[PDB]
Write a protein that binds this ligand. Structure first.
Ligand code: Y01
Ligand code: Y01
Ligand code: Y01
Ligand code: Y01
Ligand code: A1AAF
Ligand code: 42L
Ligand code: MYS
Ligand code: NAG
Ligand code: D12
Ligand code: D12
Ligand code: D12
Ligand code: D12
Ligand code: D12
Ligand code: D12
Ligand code: D10
Ligand code: D10
Ligand code: D10
Ligand code: D10
Ligand code: D10
Ligand code: D10
Ligand code: D10
Ligand code: D10
Ligand code: OCT
Ligand code: OCT
Ligand code: HP6
Ligand code: HP6
Ligand code: HP6
Ligand code: HP6
Ligand code: HP6
Ligand code: HP6
Ligand code: HP6
Ligand code: HP6
Ligand code: LNK
Ligand code: LNK
Ligand code: LNK
Ligand code: LNK
Ligand code: LNK
Ligand code: LNK
Ligand code: LNK
Ligand code: NA
Ligand code: ZN
Length: 553
């Protein structure tokens, strides 16, 4: 049987929008806007989005749609550079070991909200230390009843001495995790017919909840101060070299490229689809969602800062668990706080689940495409992948699970994402040929891309990605959680996994070069030439050997 397609185009659009829209998308852009700049942070962000943010999205969508294969089989245009598909598959697999525990924490918090007394209001109970002090006129948000609850009565962090004292897993978090994985499996087992229909609810509820919170948040005292702090113009901030680095890193990391998800999602699209309009619409929606969500979150942050009589700089911080500490404290003061907590955690759960589903779907699709023996049994392979991910994600459930979560979050994606994106971009734009790519896009859609797209694909994007990779590998900082310093072997293991996700390109390159028969010239010709050019290569007319193809744009 031939490849199946999306039931409706709205399914594909909602799938990509839901995967791209993330919990980090809600916070990262507004936090960066407040930290350096404000209204002046939109200049570097928009500049980099135009220069090298849209071309990568468009190229990934077009490649996936035209080649009609997953992340690994899409590389018939350059067989030697096939290890990129395995690299992105490994990257997607690694991220699945802690996103699910994030969703499990959110789901556990959701269950403990159907009560008239939410268990983070006061601090007269069993799981609170005698150092509780919630003062309402030096860590002002440390030892808060909400923070103490999250750290002791949920995570049980105080019973671990570090990453060497994990201890047995907790059964409540394990039950939440198994519920999450059951949801994931039953949402991913029947191909894309049912995975594109479940997205209809998990990609439209967060917007409703965000609208409700914006309606509630604005009326709070001190919210206008938070919004003013969020959006304040300061053009002198553009003279520092850190604002541009932050903008470039955020543009690279918020797109969703590098996981091989957009290739698999667009692989099921019809051959006559219009990927240009789809890329434009998805990028615009994902960019505006961050703006609206920032309005909401900074209104709430301003209200909390006014309540605690502290500057907004102390409230606005980046860390794991602060989402479960500040806002739940803010929610409890409002009347009918149970409903607000319920909707808050429902929105969190949906935001997590859509992205986790997309990330697992990328791996499943790529591995199914690569090997034909698994194509006849998709449900069993999905069950095996889910079981493996669930077994390898049981470490974040233990008492010292926050340390493992921090290490994995620091090292899993890192520079590996940028290296994979750079390698795939340079491969597509140089080895295959930007002219051939434009011809394929014209055949697929009908209108050939203009000179701007070709220039951005060929010249600007590889240079921007290389600069991002270098600046990310130069300013590396070891991970930490509060006043905890990770052991040296933990950093070594993090670097080992980060390199292992990246060290598949040379391995496959060497294996493919040694496997092909002939001399050096024959091996190179069969390796670096497209599959469809086999007849020309046999005659001895390889286009890559000529330098005119290399210097063509
Ligand atoms: C309840 C209120 C307060 C919030 C509602 C939020 C969502 C229901 C909306 C917000 C933005 C909408 C999107 C905005 C733009 C488009 C483009 C629109 O046009 C197409 O791309 C046409 C595709 C086709 O031909 O089917 C398709 C729906 C979509 C994704 C919308 C789907 C529904 C979304 C997610
Ligand atoms: C990317 C994939 C492969 C997941 C990687 C997860 C790591 C962060 C895990 C996998 C192996 C784990 C180690 C396996 C064995 C142990 C012994 C263990 O010994 C104890 O003190 C607890 C013993 C017990 O459970 O009773 C302490 C944690 C540690 C170092 C673990 C720390 C966390 C590690 C490195
Ligand atoms: C909200 C999400 C994350 C989890 C819950 C989703 C389930 C309620 C849905 C998703 C997939 C659905 C299934 C998808 C396909 C089928 C096969 C279908 O059987 C047929 O008639 C076609 C196949 C056959 O001939 O067996 C019957 C409904 C069923 C079991 C569906 C029942 C409802 C399911 C389990
Ligand atoms: C930060 C918030 C407030 C808005 C963010 C939205 C942007 C990420 C989107 C919205 C409209 C998009 C643009 C819509 C149309 C085009 C035209 C397109 O260029 C052409 O078609 C050729 C024009 C030429 O010849 O220069 C290149 C992409 C671009 C700039 C898009 C880039 C991405 C943009 C700026
Ligand atoms: C104030 N502090 C934080 N607030 C928030 C928020 C929020 C709201 C959304 C809608 C509202 Cl309404 S409020 N998000 C944070 C914070 N600090 C880290 N994050 C992210 C980071 O991306 C990090 O990667 C992360 C994580 O590790 O979560 C377990 C995913 C969180
Ligand atoms: C840690 O990586 C992420 O959270 C990325 C992405 C994602 C990829 C894989 C995954 F399993 C779950 C989520 C979801 C979105 C798009 C890219 C980025 N997130 C901002
Ligand atoms: C924690 C993992 C949960 C996986 C989902 C449990 C149900 C598995 C059902 C398998 C059906 C296979 C299709 C028929 C062979
Ligand atoms: C709070 O008091 C406890 C006493 O059990 C002590 O162990 C802890 O270090 C104190 N924390 C701070 C921040 O003072
Ligand atoms: C039995 C205690 C119920 C507490 C209130 C819960 C309200 C949930 C419904 C609103 C969100 C849909
Ligand atoms: C959490 C509930 C799990 C129930 C599992 C039922 C599996 C049904 C498979 C039907 C195959 C035709
Ligand atoms: C919480 C998810 C529960 C999913 C139950 C699916 C049951 C499938 C029955 C199939 C009968 C033909
Ligand atoms: C989609 C439904 C939105 C309803 C939002 C209501 C929020 C409470 C308003 C309180 C005004 C004082
Ligand atoms: C809150 C997000 C709203 C985003 C609205 C974007 C609408 C784009 C429509 C494009 C039609 C061609
Ligand atoms: C669709 C439901 C969104 C959340 C509604 C919460 C209940 C608000 C009732 C009015 C409060 C004054
Ligand atoms: C002390 C009880 C520990 C239970 C762990 C959860 C079961 C794991 C099954 C693989
Ligand atoms: C210790 C009493 C409760 C046991 C629960 C067993 C199931 C946990 C999730 C698999
Ligand atoms: C046929 C169009 C369906 C649009 C997505 C579902 C909207 C649900 C609104 C709550
Ligand atoms: C893109 C140019 C941005 C210039 C910002 C203002 C610089 C002021 C220098 C005194
Ligand atoms: C009083 C300030 C109100 C701000 C509203 C912002 C709306 C952003 C688009 C949904
Ligand atoms: C939870 C384990 C379920 C395993 C699937 C059912 C047996 C399939 C044998 C081919
Ligand atoms: C012969 C039928 C089962 C073949 C194996 C299916 C995938 C199992 C996990 C690799
Ligand atoms: C991919 C090659 C670079 C590996 C990381 C940088 C060297 C170690 C720095 C501590
Ligand atoms: C007092 C003005 C409230 C405005 C709420 C947001 C309207 C879109
Ligand atoms: C710290 C930035 C170094 C940039 C080197 C050149 C990259 C193109
Ligand atoms: C991004 C546009 C900022 C303009 C500020 C004018 C006061
Ligand atoms: C000492 C307890 C061991 C539990 C193992 C669970 C996988
Ligand atoms: C208090 C949380 C209990 C979770 C039970 C999941 C079945
Ligand atoms: C064709 C039936 C689709 C149901 C979608 C429910 C959200
Ligand atoms: C590609 C990495 C080059 C070396 C970076 C550290 C100097
Ligand atoms: C203290 C040494 C621990 C080694 C762990 C290797 C995974
Ligand atoms: C000629 C092929 C070179 C591939 C190198 C990959 C890093
Ligand atoms: C994968 C690195 C070694 C390859 C050897 C091929 C003979
Ligand atoms: C739209 C950016 C902020 C203007 C004050
Ligand atoms: C994760 C890829 C391993 C080789 C198929
Ligand atoms: C007062 C305008 C704020 C941005 C819409
Ligand atoms: C992770 C192994 C996939 C099948 C070779
Ligand atoms: C998943 C591997 C199947 C046998 C080559
Ligand atoms: C606790 C999980 C052990 C097998 C991966
Ligand atoms: C068949 C190739 C698997 C990865 C080296
Ligand atoms: Na998401
Ligand atoms: Zn307080």
């Amino acid at each position: 049987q031939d490849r199946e397609t999306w039931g409706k185009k709205i399914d594909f659009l909602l799938s990509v929008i839901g995967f791209a829209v993330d919990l980090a998308n809600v916070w990262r852009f507004p936090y960066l806007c407040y930290k350096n700049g404000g209204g002046a942070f939109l200049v570097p962000y928009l500049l980099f989005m135009v220069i090298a943010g849209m071309p990568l999205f468009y190229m990934e969508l077009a490649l996936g749609q035209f080649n009609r294969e997953g992340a690994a089989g899409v590389w018939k245009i350059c067989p030697i550079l096939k290890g990129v598909g395995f690299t992105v598959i490994l990257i997607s697999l690694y991220v699945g070991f802690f996103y699910n525990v994030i969703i499990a924490w959110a789901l556990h918090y959701l269950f403990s909200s159907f009560t008239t007394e939410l268990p983070w209001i006061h601090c007269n109970n069993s799981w609170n230390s005698p150092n509780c002090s919630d003062a309402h006129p030096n860590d002002t948000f440390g030892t808060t009843p909400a923070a103490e609850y999250f750290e002791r009565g949920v995570l049980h962090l105080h019973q671990s001495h570090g990453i060497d004292d994990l201890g047995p897993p907790r059964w409540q978090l394990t039950a939440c995790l198994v519920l999450v994985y059951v949801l994931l499996y039953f949402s991913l087992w029947k191909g894309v017919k049912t995975s594109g229909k479940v997205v209809w609810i998990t990609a439209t509820m967060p917007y409703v909840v965000l609208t409700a919170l914006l309606l509630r948040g604005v009326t709070l005292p001190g919210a206008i101060d938070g919004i003013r702090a969020y959006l304040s113009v300061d053009f002198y901030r553009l003279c520092e070299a850190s604002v541009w680095i932050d903008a470039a890193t955020q543009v690279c990391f918020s797109l969703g490229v590098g996981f091989g998800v957009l290739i698999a999602f667009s692989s099921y699209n019809k051959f006559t689809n219009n990927c240009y309009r789809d890329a434009i619409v998805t990028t615009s929606i994902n960019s505006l969602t961050s703006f609206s969500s920032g309005f909401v979150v900074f209104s709430f942050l301003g209200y909390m800062a006014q309540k605690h009589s502290v500057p907004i700089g102390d409230v606005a911080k980046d860390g794991p668990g602060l989402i479960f500490i500040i806002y739940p404290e803010a929610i409890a003061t409002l009347p009918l706080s149970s409903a607000w907590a319920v909707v808050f955690f429902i929105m969190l759960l949906t935001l997590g689940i859509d992205s986790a589903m997309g990330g697992m779907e990328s791996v499943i699709t790529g591995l199914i495409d690569e090997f034909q023996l698994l194509h006849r049994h998709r449900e069993l392979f999905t069950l095996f992948i889910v079981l493996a991910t669930f077994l390898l994600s049981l470490f974040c459930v233990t008492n010292g699970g926050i340390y493992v979560f921090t290490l994995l979050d620091h090292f899993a994606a890192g520079t590996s994402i940028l290296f994979g994106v750079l390698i795939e971009a340079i491969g597509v734009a140089w080895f295959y040929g930007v002219g051939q790519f434009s011809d394929d896009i014209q055949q697929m859609t009908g209108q050939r891309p203009s000179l701007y797209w070709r220039l951005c694909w060929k010249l600007v994007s590889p240079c921007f990605l290389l600069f991002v990779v270098v600046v990310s590998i130069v300013t590396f900082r070891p991970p930490h959680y509060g006043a905890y310093i990770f052991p040296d072997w933990a950093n070594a293991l993090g670097w080992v996994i980060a390199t292992s996700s990246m060290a598949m390109v040379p391995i496959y390159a060497a294996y493919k070069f040694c496997s092909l028969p002939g001399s050096f010239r024959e091996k190179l010709a069969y390796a670096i030439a497209p599959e469809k050019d086999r007849e020309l290569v046999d005659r001895g007319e390889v286009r890559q050997f000529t330098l005119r193809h290399w210097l063509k744009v």
